[PDB]
């Protein structure tokens, strides 16, 4: 009763060693590399490889190979073969061309509804609009390149779909298909892929992940061609509709072909050359943005980088394939050196595609994930990092002293800035007399008056404990869905038994009897679930006692996923704790961890391999400061104290080491490829924030040594250094020469100091610039932003980013991904049409091919379409599908992107937005005017819809705990369910059987805790769901709920404690039932009898959509008043005008740009961020470093509760029990730590996770600078109607609407309007005054919730901790 659902997209990596093992066993020789993997695979092959080799088709192919008839090639040869396939003539051609014509026509017809709605609301007004009629005339003949990529993708996806379906139906199914892709024969499992080309007499062996990568390549190229065709047709109709980039697609297809030829000529090694082309595109960008010296230096460096990569690729290929079965596969164009002609032509095609255009050049970053992924040799990457991590570094003691002193100076300075005093010094007698004055005055000198001698003096400072370690572990930070490394003694369980020697197998079977079930887990989740002796103070005791030091169980496991490193559970705990302590205590002191001329330059360094150069002597001189600040020892120094004593092993399944007989300890196994010891620290990812703040300290030290200002910004593996220095210009020296000279000297100094602390910068990682802002992978020149938005939507396809192929999550992912063509690409129509192409594919074409729900979802959607045709009196099922694909997913429709999302990003009421979207969409059929007041005209279709929306059978169940979990929930089965609600009972049933008594006891009391949590706040007669969320987040049930919600997103929840990758049939049935109910929801929301023939149809005369939304939300919960949730929809409330009325009386958005177009331009105004008005709160004066972060978060939550619910009849008892239960203090003691809120309206100002903090527009930030808004004429109207009374209309969204509206009107009319005037509908705006809450909180139920889920309560503020608070 267990099925296996394989991947439809490349999620993992393509394995070099899996491919090598399979192909070496199949062809009985070294396939890709002469290493131990091929030998062990030929000596003792896996059962799944033996199954592939023993097939009849495989036996015949091996017979042909051993006779010399077919030639063995590398998977990149066949990638180039596949991406060229166009064999079959006129039959697949007519079929594919007809399918693509149909998809494009249907996508334009579905987009017509929204385009009509938008043009009718803006006042600009099967296909009704003229624009899309012209577009349908333009797009009725798909070009040959698009047809080519679509046909290839369709064939590969058909092969994959057939395999996945028959693999669900049958375990062990091997697909053998030589008819789908004509000419190729595929032999596909999850354990291997054998592709054989007959007329070329070529055969290759590869993996399932490589077939997934090939299908992803074909999909990515189809998506590039599709987006570019849509955009080019849109720009032919209107230069403002499409994207700002314009691509020739024959040049793009030639690019694809030439990259494929580079990957076929150079084998797997050719991805070096492919990767070095980002530098070429950046050089083409800098030839436009930069000045002669900077651009020339970058161009020469880039050419050297590309040719060095190509020479290294050639050498490595020739050295790898020399003693393998691929020795005769290297072309003569490699040794001829005539590969440089191919590379030249590829680069020339890239320069032609860029077209000397920043838009094309920034968009061309999709080329880097359009050619696939390389097979990464795991042992070889191990060996590459070994030489860097075993090298002895030589330091001047003064360099280490200055680095430690700069770190200590930044600590002192940030501590004085944030806490108004120096840190507590335990040896303050070491400061001469000049620093004693700073210490006693609680000040510090600036970096200018600072001296290197000062840093050397500060390096001698030691500290007392300022911050405290949490005593109880945060289970949210320590639990995840990744894998855990086994102990050192159980490290051989990471390889197949066939690949391990017999003595290793006997030793494993004997050693499993000496470890617990947590130490034999292989997963983090089950590592913690199986711990029958788990204690919440175990990590704290391990850190205090240094139980991680000299631990025999320590090992570092490396996996091909850039060599993702793993270690056992204890040490992973320690690593996560050190990183969390840094992130939450120290990163506040390092805010960049997120004359006649002043020279300026920019230096960009790659910090990806910065960790490998770090030793104890350089990182722990600062980790010791962090240890002293936390009263602990070696917690932040744990890496360079423990890792040098362990063994670094490559633990990929098909990359085992050679274990000499009689040797069974990993620390005794001979050092070899993929196995070495004495790793002198620098594991990637671990201790990353420490090394970031050390880089910031070194940058301050460099700024002090070079006497120039530095504005650093270290974002992950890339730091940007803005350097400024006031110079005096020499005789005839230009500003550019001065900037370049500053850049050169600063580069010399940066190199010198990094080499002082042991890091050898290389010319390929670092480049100097002057003005070009290239940070966070975004091109930004002269204030204008240049997006790479086609790169974000390369993987848009049917079953994307979903669990068990969930239909709804797939639609939502398609919409969310395709929305970046409008948010970044600044094209509403291109985003819309692309999204509709792929949504139509998903719904109409791929829904009948579900791997687990074979065609039940399609029959359900056909039922829904017939119901919609009967309800809305539509012509056929095509009109019904067009309507379904435009109805909101809240009501059961298939539209993931509501219309408000095109004008502002956030909203405080999803129900009003869904109703407004439905009104705007149904105006396409009812011919209602969106510029008029709602009217009854002749058509009761919108009347019927609204009647069905407000009329339903009330059926509330657990309303308060549901409004706690989701303050915007509906109830009475009026909305679609999500997987966390459907799966949570299964999660708790599974957790109740866990050996860990924390999870077990929290899951056994889960139903009763929910029943009590529903009773706590059930008699507070005005219902405030956001205050309910604040109550819910202050209780320990919230952490349990987060753990359960994390677990419920897993595949096969029931098989979590079963040690299997299979999926239980009960999980499949649960997901199937959920999908079917979610699909057919729109039948139950829109009954054919309208649910009321006694109550007549609703009258839309003087109808408020917001009053209707409030009524729906209250009736669905059978409550009387729900406050602080319903808010008007600004897209609906605002009437759009372009001429000044009698008196303005609206929001006036004006264009300050002088041109009639503002896309790609910047204006004088400040960017619009959103940034809702914040609270007014008085912070009490106390020592906050004495409290942990969770304790201060709990204090903030309890202060918000004292603010919102200050008027309940039980407030003293409520707050007393909350303070005793969650903080351990009495209410009179805890209240002295509460921020006191000066804002009267908590319905406006309350800050919850369930409320948006910012309200941005659906427009890039650079573009908001072109427009000026004026909310003065609307203020007088709002104050003459609601004088000094608060109302529920959001201001930030009202300006976001106007800005995005200016942008959209420019898109649709090819001219930006001079002004736009938003006139509000006053009947949609209501008062939002904070209520007077009546009723008593159930104190018994509150304390029973606290007592049942006590295992997740935070640390209590001690007496020892409370006395230190006010010293």
């Amino acid at each position: 009763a267990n099925v296996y659902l394989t991947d439809s997209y490349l999620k993992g990596v393509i394995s070099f060693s899996e491919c090598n093992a399979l192909g070496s066993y199949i062809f009985n020789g070294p396939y890709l590399k002469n290493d131990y993997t091929n030998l062990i695979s030929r000596q003792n092959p896996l059962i799944e490889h033996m199954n592939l080799k023993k097939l009849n088709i495989t036996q015949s192919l091996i017979s042909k190979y051993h006779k010399g008839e077919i030639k063995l090639e590398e998977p990149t040869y066949f990638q180039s073969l596949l991406m060229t396939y166009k064999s079959m003539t006129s039959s697949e051609q007519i079929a594919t061309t007809n399918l693509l014509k149909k998809i494009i026509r249907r996508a334009i017809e579905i987009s017509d509804v929204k385009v009509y709605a938008i043009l009718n609301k803006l006042g600009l007004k099967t296909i009704k609009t003229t624009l899309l009629k012209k577009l349908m005339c333009s797009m009725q003949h798909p070009p040959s390149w698009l047809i080519h990529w679509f046909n290839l993708y369709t064939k590969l996806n058909n092969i994959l779909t057939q395999y996945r379906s028959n693999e669900v139906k049958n375990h062990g199914f091997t697909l053998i298909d030589n008819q789908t892709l004509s000419g190729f024969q595929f032999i596909l499992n999850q354990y291997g892929c054998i592709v054989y080309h007959k007329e070329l007499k070529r055969i290759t062996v590869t993996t399932y992940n490589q077939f997934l990568t090939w299908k992803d390549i074909s999909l990515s190229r189809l998506n590039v061609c599709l987006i570019t065709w849509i955009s080019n047709c849109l720009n032919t109709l209107n230069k403002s509709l499409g994207l700002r980039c314009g691509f020739n697609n024959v040049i793009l297809t030639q690019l694809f072909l030439y990259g494929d030829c580079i990957l076929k000529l150079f084998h797997n090694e050719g991805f070096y050359i492919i990767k070095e082309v980002e530098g070429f595109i950046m050089s083409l960008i800098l030839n436009i943005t930069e000045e002669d010296q900077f651009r020339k230096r970058f161009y020469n460096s880039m050419l050297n980088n590309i040719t060095d990569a190509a020479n290294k690729a050639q050498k490595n290929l020739l050295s790898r394939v020399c003693h393998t079965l691929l020795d005769k596969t290297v072309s003569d164009n490699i040794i001829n050196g005539r590969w440089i002609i191919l590379l030249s032509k590829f680069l020339k095609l890239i320069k032609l595609a860029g077209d000397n255009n920043l838009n094309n050049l920034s968009e061309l970053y999709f080329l880097f994930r359009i050619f696939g992924h390389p097979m990464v040799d795991e042992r070889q990457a191990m060996d590459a990092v070994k030489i860097n991590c075993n090298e002895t570094k030589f330091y001047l003691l003064s360099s280490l002293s200055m680095l430690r002193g700069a770190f200590i100076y930044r600590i002192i300075k940030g501590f004085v800035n944030n806490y108004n005093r120096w840190p507590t010094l335990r040896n303050a007698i070491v400061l001469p007399l000049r620093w004693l004055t700073y210490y006693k005055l609680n000040t510090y000198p600036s970096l200018l008056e600072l001296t290197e001698r000062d840093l050397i003096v500060l390096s001698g400072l030691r500290f007392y404990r300022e911050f405290r370690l949490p005593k109880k572990v945060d289970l949210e930070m320590i639990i995840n869905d990744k894998a855990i490394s086994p102990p050192k003694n159980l490290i051989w369980t990471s390889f197949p038994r066939n690949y391990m020697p017999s003595h290793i197998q006997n030793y494993i079977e004997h050693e499993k009897l000496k470890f617990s079930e947590s130490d034999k887990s292989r997963r983090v989740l089950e590592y913690y679930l199986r711990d029958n002796k788990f204690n919440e103070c175990d990590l704290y005791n391990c850190v205090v006692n240094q139980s991680y030091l000299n631990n025999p169980n320590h090992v570092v496991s490396l996996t091909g996923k850039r060599m993702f490193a793993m270690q056992p559970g204890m040490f992973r705990q320690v690593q996560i704790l050190a990183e969390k302590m840094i992130a939450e205590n120290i990163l506040q002191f390092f805010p960049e961890s997120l004359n006649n001329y002043i020279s300026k330059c920019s230096i960009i360094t790659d910090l990806s391999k910065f960790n490998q150069a770090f030793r104890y002597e350089t990182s722990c001189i600062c980790s010791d400061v962090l240890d002293e600040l936390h009263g602990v020892q070696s917690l932040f120094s744990w890496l360079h104290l423990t890792i040098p004593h362990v063994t670094i092993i490559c633990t990929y399944r098909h990359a085992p080491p050679y274990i000499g007989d009689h040797i069974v300890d990993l620390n005794n196994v001979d050092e070899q490829s993929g196995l070495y010891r004495y790793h002198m620290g620098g594991i990637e990812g671990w201790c990353q924030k420490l090394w970031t703040i050390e880089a910031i300290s070194l940058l301050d030290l460099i700024s002090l040594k070079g006497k120039f200002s530095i504005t650093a910004l270290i974002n992950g593996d890339n730091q940007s250094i803005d350097i400024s220095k006031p110079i005096r210009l020499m005789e005839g020296q230009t500003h550019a020469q001065a900037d370049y000279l500053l850049a050169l000297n600063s580069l010399k100094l940066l190199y010198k100091e990094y080499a002082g602390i042991g890091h050898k910068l290389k010319g390929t990682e670092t480049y100097i610039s002057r003005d070009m802002q290239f940070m966070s992978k975004t091109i930004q020149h002269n204030g204008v932003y240049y997006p790479a938005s086609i790169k974000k939507v390369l993987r848009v396809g049917p079953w994307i980013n979903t669990i068990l192929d969930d239909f709804k999550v797939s639609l939502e992912s398609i919409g969310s991904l395709t929305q970046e063509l409008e948010y970044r690409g600044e094209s509403l129509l291109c985003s819309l049409i692309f999204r509709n192409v792929w949504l139509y594919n998903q719904i109409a074409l791929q829904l009948k091919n579900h791997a687990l729900c074979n065609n039940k979802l399609y029959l359900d959607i056909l039922k829904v379409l017939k119901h919609l045709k009967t309800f809305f009196n539509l012509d056929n099922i095509d009109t019904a599908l067009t309507l379904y694909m435009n109805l909101p997913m809240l009501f059961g429709g298939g539209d993931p992107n509501l219309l408000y999302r095109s004008f502002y990003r956030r909203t405080p009421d999803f129900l009003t937005e869904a109703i407004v979207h439905s009104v705007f969409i149904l105006s396409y059929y009812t011919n209602h005017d969106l510029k008029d007041k709602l009217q009854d005209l002749s058509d009761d279709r919108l009347n019927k819809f609204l009647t069905c929306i407000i009329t339903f059978d009330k059926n509330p169940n657990a309303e308060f705990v549901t409004l706690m979990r989701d303050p915007q929930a509906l109830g009475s089965e009026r909305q679609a369910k999500i997987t966390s609600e459907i799966n949570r009972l299964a999660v708790t049933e599974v957790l109740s059987t866990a050996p860990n008594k924390i999870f077990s006891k929290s899951a056994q009391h889960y139903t009763t805790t929910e029943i009590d949590l529903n009773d706590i706040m059930q008699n507070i007669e005005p219902t405030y769901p956001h205050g309910l969320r604040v109550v819910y987040e202050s209780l320990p049930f919230y952490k349990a709920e987060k753990i359960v919600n994390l677990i419920s997103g897993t595949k096969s929840i029931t098989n979590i404690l079963e040690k299997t990758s299979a999926i239980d049939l009960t999980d499949i049935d649960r997901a199937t039932e959920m999908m079917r109910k979610n699909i057919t929801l729109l039948i139950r929301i829109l009954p054919l009898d309208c649910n009321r023939d006694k109550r007549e149809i609703l009258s839309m005369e003087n109808l408020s959509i917001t009053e209707l939304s409030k009524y729906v939300r209250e009736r669905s919960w059978s409550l009387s008043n729900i406050v602080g949730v319903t808010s008007p929809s600004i897209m609906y409330t605002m009437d759009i005008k372009y001429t000044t009325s009698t008196i303005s009386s609206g929001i006036i958005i004006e264009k300050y740009n002088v041109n009639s177009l503002t896309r790609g331009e910047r204006g004088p105004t400040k960017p619009w961020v959103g940034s809702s008005t914040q609270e007014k709160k008085t912070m009490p004066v106390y020592n906050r470093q004495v409290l942990t972060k969770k304790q201060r978060d709990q204090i903030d939550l309890l202060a918000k509760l004292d603010w919102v619910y200050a008027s309940i009849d039980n407030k003293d008892e409520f707050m007393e029990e909350l303070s005793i239960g969650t903080l351990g203090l009495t209410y009179e003691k805890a209240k002295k730590l509460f921020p006191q809120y000066l804002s009267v309206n908590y319905l406006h100002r309350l800050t919850v996770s369930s409320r948006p903090c910012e309200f941005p527009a659906s427009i890039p930030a650079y573009r908001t600078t072109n427009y000026h808004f004026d909310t003065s004429p609307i203020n007088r109207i709002l104050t003459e109607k609601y004088g000094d009374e608060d109302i529920d209309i959001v201001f930030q969204n009202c300006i976001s609407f106007g800005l995005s509206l200016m942008s959209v009107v420019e898109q649709f009319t090819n001219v930006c309007p001079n002004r736009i005037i938003l006139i509000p509908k006053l009947n949609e705006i209501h008062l939002m005054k904070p209520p007077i809450f009546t009723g008593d909180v159930d104190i018994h139920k509150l304390k029973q919730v606290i007592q049942k889920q006590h295992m997740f309560l935070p640390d209590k503020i001690s007496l020892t901790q409370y006395v230190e608070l006010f010293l």
Partner: protein, 62 residues
């Protein structure tokens, strides 16, 4: 004048202290943690001494 000489001597002594303390901290590396001598080179701190204090005041019941 003698006070200026003493203040310069104190500055030089502070520099020597910084250098020698950086040396002490950098010399307490992997081999000192392996040999169990690192807390003698870096010092005892708040958490370990609190552990000592608890061990000292709950021996049997006192």
């Amino acid at each position: 004048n003698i006070t200026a000489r003493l203040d310069r001597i104190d500055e030089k002594l502070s520099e020597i202290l910084g250098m020698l303390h950086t040396l002490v901290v950098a010399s307490a590396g992997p081999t000192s943690a392996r040999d169990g001598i690192r807390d003698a080179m870096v010092g005892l701190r708040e958490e370990m001494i609190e552990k000592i204090r608890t061990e000292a005041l709950m021996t049997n019941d006192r």
